[PDB]
Amino acid sequence: TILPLNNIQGDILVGMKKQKERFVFFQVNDATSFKTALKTYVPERITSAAILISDPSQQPLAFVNLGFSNTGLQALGITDDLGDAQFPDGQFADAANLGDDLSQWVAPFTGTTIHGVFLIGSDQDDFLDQFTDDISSTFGSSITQVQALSGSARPGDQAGHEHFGFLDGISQPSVTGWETTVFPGQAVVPPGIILTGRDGDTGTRPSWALDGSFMAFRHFQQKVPEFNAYTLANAIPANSAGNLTQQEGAEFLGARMFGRWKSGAPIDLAPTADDPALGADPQRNNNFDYSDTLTDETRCPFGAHVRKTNPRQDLGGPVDTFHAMRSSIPYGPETSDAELASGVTAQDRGLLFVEYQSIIGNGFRFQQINWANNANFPFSKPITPGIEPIIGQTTPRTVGGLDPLNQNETFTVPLFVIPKGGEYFFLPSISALTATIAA
Ligand code: HEM
Ligand SMILES: *[C@@H]1O[C@H](CO)[C@@H](O)[C@H](O)[C@H]1NC(C)=O
């Protein structure tokens, strides 16, 4: 297979990787006028994977991709079943299954009023705003914007880090079917793990759904002073290398919860102290598989974030099925000294989370329910793994093994990541947008 890179929406396969991103959630008011606008809009603005891998001199000043919810497709008379079990009912109907406190969800996510999302990525706000205004102008009264969520990479040396302080976007699957760089320890999977209708996809897809993907969007609010206070209050006293100062023990506890230090250094490789050079080196920072720690937790807890969401050798060998692409962006202001000192969140900040897969139930949803929320996953371990401390939702939120020298000790972790809403979208191929959606 040769993937048609010019026909695949770029955020799916390559990722926008822009400093700013805006998600414009909309409802369709006038299907005919929307379709008319779509036919002029798509060829001019919708950014392919081929454009994203091009030299920056050949790229537009902002990228745009577009996805539709089930109700958006129905509003447009696009009635063929896409073959996914969760997509038709929408994410609000699935939120309880995910473990969400529904009382924290907010409009307009609390139902299926949202018909779709334009995602706009750019390296500065001006261009982001111009391309957002271009959507408003092009589509006019054919849509109503029901929400816009805007994110930004964190400043300075925190660029690429999420709000708890951890480098994000290190580990992604690589799909066959195109020419790209594969790093040591990176999973290589058939393209149909990500792209509907391609090899590896077992879902029943209409022919027009070829080279689309499903997005799981989640709006997470993060409680950063609370996270930091918890790590200080539960600082690990010592590890194999020796005693830790409280500050060292708090940093170590955060790394034990994630499975990586803030620098990106994976604890499986750097189990006692950060190695910032390792974290920054993509030739090394993914080259582990837990094979050195399958039946003990000294090198890595069984329930650490990255281990729960990608179990690697905990599954017994490579497995294609449950990999997914992520293109998330932080949002909100930096956490002040006063906020950190008080231990109490005073400002809205978090993660606009985006995960792509051909089968929602095998990617995002499997990682969430079967793995993160599952106290007995990974399976067949000598100590109960417990609930993933970052995004596991089961209560009590008890996780074992965080202290490598007292692995039977359990930690009951307050929830620091609050789901505020989300939706399941389908992003068609670029040709499908005009030949099918806008027909
Ligand atoms: C605000 C919430 C979240 C934060 C702050 C967060 C943060 C992180 C960080 C720091 C990493 C390590 C960097 C990397 O390996 O790329 C990571 C990895 C990852 N996360 Fe999350 N995450 C969040 C939510 C989620 C959710 C909800 C899921 C899916 C249910 C998820 C799935 C993954 C996956 C698949 C990886 C890569 C694991 C690997 O291949 O080793 N994350 N995340
Ligand atoms: C390590 O910490 C313990 C207290 O937990 C203390 O008794 C001991 O003296 C420390 N060891 C070293 C080498 O500093």
Side-chain angles (χ1 to χ4, degrees):
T1 170
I2 298 297
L3 297 173
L5 302 177
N6 292 283
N7 204 39
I8 293 163
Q9 295 197 61
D11 199 48
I12 300 166
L13 189 67
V14 181
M16 292 189 180
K17 301 178 202 301
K18 294 291 95 180
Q19 293 273 300
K20 314 297 184 177
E21 189 179 10
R22 180 167 291 142
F23 299 82
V24 175
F25 301 93
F26 68 91
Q27 61 166 26
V28 176
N29 297 320
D30 178 342
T32 302
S33 294
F34 179 81
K35 291 181 186 192
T36 293
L38 194 58
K39 290 178 279 180
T40 69
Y41 187 81
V42 173
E44 301 295 339
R45 299 281 174 257
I46 296 287
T47 311
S48 71
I51 297 300
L52 288 193
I53 65 169
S54 298
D55 190 82
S57 205
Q58 274 76 51
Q59 296 183 331
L61 288 169
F63 308 139
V64 186
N65 282 182
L66 171 63
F68 294 94
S69 71
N70 174 71
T71 50
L73 294 179
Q74 302 318 130
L76 297 168
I78 308 301
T79 52
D80 300 324
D81 179 8
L82 282 166
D84 187 83
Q86 279 77 48
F87 177 73
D89 286 336
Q91 193 190 108
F92 188 48
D94 204 33
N97 297 325
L98 302 171
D100 287 15
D101 177 358
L102 303 180
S103 78
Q104 297 302 317
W105 274 56
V106 300
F109 293 99
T110 47
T112 55
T113 61
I114 293 167
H115 288 167
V117 59
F118 291 88
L119 42 158
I120 310 98
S122 189
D123 284 330
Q124 77 194 54
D125 289 320
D126 316 78
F127 304 147
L128 195 75
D129 292 351
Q130 289 174 12
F131 277 70
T132 305
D133 290 353
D134 178 56
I135 291 160
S136 296
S137 173
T138 298
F139 288 91
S141 55
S142 79
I143 67 177
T144 290
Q145 168 188 126
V146 293
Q147 183 59 290
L149 300 176
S150 296
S152 55
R154 296 187 49 232
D157 61 33
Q158 292 302 293
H161 298 234
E162 57 70 49
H163 276 290
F164 297 140
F166 294 74
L167 185 62
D168 193 6
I170 297 165
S171 186
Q172 308 273 14
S174 185
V175 301
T176 64
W178 69 305
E179 194 201 349
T180 195
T181 55
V182 175
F183 297 115
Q186 197 172 8
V188 174
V189 301
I193 303 307
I194 306 303
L195 296 168
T196 46
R198 293 291 180 184
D199 285 351
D201 182 13
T202 57
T204 300
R205 315 300 178 190
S207 69
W208 59 258
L210 183 63
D211 287 331
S213 187
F214 291 96
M215 179 199 293
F217 178 82
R218 306 275 276 159
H219 171 194
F220 298 126
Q221 186 166 352
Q222 284 171 256
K223 302 292 203 171
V224 178
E226 291 85 351
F227 178 88
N228 187 252
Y230 181 84
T231 68
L232 286 162
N234 296 278
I236 293 171
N239 65 30
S240 294
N243 284 343
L244 302 174
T245 66
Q246 187 188 15
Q247 182 89 322
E248 285 168 345
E251 297 290 354
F252 186 51
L253 183 62
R256 293 285 287 181
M257 296 162 80
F258 269 100
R260 294 186 180 274
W261 297 91
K262 288 174 177 172
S263 71
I267 69 179
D268 196 29
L269 300 184
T272 59
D274 193 13
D275 184 342
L278 164 60
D281 186 0
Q283 301 299 329
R284 290 186 294 153
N285 67 13
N286 219 17
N287 197 15
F288 64 95
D289 66 1
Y290 313 116
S291 62
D292 62 0
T293 194
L294 298 170
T295 56
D296 203 77
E297 304 189 75
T298 296
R299 298 189 74 85
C300 187
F302 299 136
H305 183 71
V306 299
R307 184 170 190 173
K308 283 278 214 168
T309 62
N310 179 5
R312 305 186 188 219
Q313 192 65 26
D314 285 331
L315 298 186
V319 171
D320 296 336
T321 313
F322 315 109
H323 293 274
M325 297 291 196
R326 291 168 304 120
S327 195
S328 308
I329 193 169
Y331 79 87
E334 294 296 287
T335 309
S336 62
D337 314 327
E339 249 185 301
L340 286 167
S342 69
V344 173
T345 289
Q347 299 182 275
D348 187 14
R349 62 181 60 85
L351 191 68
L352 302 179
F353 175 91
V354 174
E355 193 166 27
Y356 297 106
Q357 56 274 296
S358 61
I359 301 166
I360 296 177
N362 285 352
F364 164 70
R365 194 174 186 275
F366 209 87
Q367 295 162 18
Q368 185 68 56
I369 299 176
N370 288 249
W371 292 348
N373 288 357
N374 185 349
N376 295 283
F377 185 85
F379 302 124
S380 308
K381 300 310 193 190
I383 297 174
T384 301
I387 304 312
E388 202 282 286
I390 307 307
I391 49 72
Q393 289 196 124
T394 303
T395 60
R397 306 193 72 249
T398 302
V399 62
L402 303 189
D403 186 341
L405 304 188
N406 300 285
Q407 298 176 24
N408 272 326
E409 293 292 319
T410 62
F411 290 70
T412 302
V413 183
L415 186 61
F416 306 121
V417 178
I418 313 301
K420 297 306 290 175
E423 192 47 278
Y424 298 138
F425 300 101
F426 181 68
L427 281 70
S429 75
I430 296 174
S431 60
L433 291 172
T434 58
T436 298
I437 310 298

